[PDB]
């Protein structure tokens, strides 16, 4: 029926900088917040807090951005039946807070899908980031499904992949996600990255894939929690872009 | 100890959505139809209709949240607030109200609306002051305002298109009046007002020399929303000095991407 793709919320490493860990972790590794936009606590990572370097969480206003989207979906009576998300912490946290706003934290389990991760050229680093596994996510108070079997596993991701690769696996996973939810529920929410909003949806329309230049141009346009929607053309296998069921979310900075 | 806290209002509708945010939000009949998640679900009705919003804009949803977090931080630091005053601008009143909610003092503290805390009237467009909402109408619209309170500088005493050092002066007098009336009835005072107010209300209180207008404006434009400065007094002396704020600062960025799509 309907596919909703949206981008994650505000990130710590963007608002507070590349050296943000020095602003919230002391010598002994204790978390000490220095700003009201930093969350009261952060999950423990199986490996230490330097794993946050490559996999930063969302800010307190990131949680709000997500929650308002959640609440907006509830106010418009848009029922989400399954939620998928990228393995990035920021994406999981965004997905979780959308559910809080949806009043469905204790009825839906988020399906962490590595195939939804962004184009690996934009990794700020040499290797893939250490992601927090589903089991360890659930224990950090994020509503994930430890049962879920990913269509693309972590090992299948090529470090520093190419445009054609990324676009291809984006299409496969979306197609796969669309298949395994046909029998169960009407609407599907993907919570992922700016790139995901374009790559995952381009062929869904039946329109030819735009080249990498016109794709970067399209990706820089998407805001935090930027939210798009696709409707199924009867049962034709092509989906067209609909007007989203909620209003857009715009705000400035502190100044 | 005895502290004075001065903080700027939260994010404004007319900055985020522009001078003509009304044309977006209100239809021909005067019905409020929000077009963004950062717009509140409703707005208070005004005496002269929605066109009164032109020069007295409300805060945004994120503006409300900013105020809420600051209130919650104050509660977490165990900072008791005994009195709260605000500029008569709707944005300041609403900011103060949401600070009280985070503080869990909505139904205990009553905000004192004080026209002398209003910003420099040179920044008001036209040759006429904003159609402010009176305290009685404010209470009726769910903002914990003190209807009893009698302002030190009423609306009629405000000079339209006033000069810098006049603004500087009345800011100084009003702060001193506010301090003086609260001396016997408690310790900590919160003032919720404008960017200019942080330097204006506290400069000469600390004996410091006010800056000239040009240097003043430059400083003013750096103060973030809910920017929060603090002053402490040495016992019963009337000598005030700057102190570290008893809460953390608040910083966040914009929504990003494009402002307009499709």
Curated annotation (Swiss-Prot), chain B:
Gene name, per UniProt, is UBASH3B
Q: Which residues form a coiled coil?
A: none
What residue spans carry the region label Protein tyrosine phosphatase? 1-262
Q: How does it assemble?
A: Homodimer. Interacts with JAK2 (in vitro). Interacts with CBL. Part of a complex containing CBL and activated EGFR. Interacts with ubiquitin and with mono-ubiquitinated proteins. Interacts with ZAP70 (ubiquitinated form).
Source organism, top-level taxon = Eukaryota
Q: What does this protein do?
A: Interferes with CBL-mediated down-regulation and degradation of receptor-type tyrosine kinases. Promotes accumulation of activated target receptors, such as T-cell receptors and EGFR, on the cell surface. Exhibits tyrosine phosphatase activity toward several substrates including EGFR, FAK, SYK, and ZAP70. Down-regulates proteins that are dually modified by both protein tyrosine phosphorylation and ubiquitination.
Name the catalytic site residues.
Answer: 8, 9 (tele-phosphohistidine intermediate), 194
Positions spanned in the full protein: 383 to 644 of 649
**Signal sequence extent:** none
Organism taxonomic ancestry: Eukaryota, Metazoa, Chordata, Craniata, Vertebrata
Q: What is this protein called?
A: Ubiquitin-associated and SH3 domain-containing protein B
Where is it located?
Cytoplasm; Nucleus
């Amino acid at each position: 029926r309907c596919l909703f793709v949206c981008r994650h919320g505000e990130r710590m490493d963007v608002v507070f900088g590349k050296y943000w860990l020095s602003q919230c972790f002391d010598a002994k590794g204790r978390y000490i917040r220095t700003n009201l936009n930093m969350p009261h606590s952060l999950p423990q990572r199986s490996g230490g807090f330097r794993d946050y370097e490559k996999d930063a969480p969302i800010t307190v206003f990131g949680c709000m951005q997500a929650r308002l989207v959640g609440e907006a979906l509830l106010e418009s009576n848009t029922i989400i039946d399954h939620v998928y998300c990228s393995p990035s912490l920021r994406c999981v946290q965004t997905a979780h807070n959308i559910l809080k706003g949806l009043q469905q934290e204790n009825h839906l389990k988020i399906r962490v899908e590595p195939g939804l991760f962004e184009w690996t050229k934009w990794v700020a680093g040499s290797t893939l980031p250490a992601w927090i596994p589903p089991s360890e996510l659930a224990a950090a108070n994020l509503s994930v499904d430890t049962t879920y079997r990913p269509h693309i596993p972590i090992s299948k991701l090529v470090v520093s992949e190419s445009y054609d690769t990324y676009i291809s696996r984006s299409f496969q996973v979306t197609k796969e996600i669309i298949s395994e939810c046909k029998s169960k529920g009407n609407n599907i929410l993907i919570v992922a990255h700016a790139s995901s909003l374009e790559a995952c949806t381009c062929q869904l329309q039946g329109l030819s894939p735009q080249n990498s230049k016109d794709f970067v141009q399209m990706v820089r346009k998407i805001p935090y929690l930027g939210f798009c929607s696709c409707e199924e053309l009867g049962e034709t296998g092509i989906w067209q872009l609909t007007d989203p069921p909620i209003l857009p979310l715009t705000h400035g900075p502190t100044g």
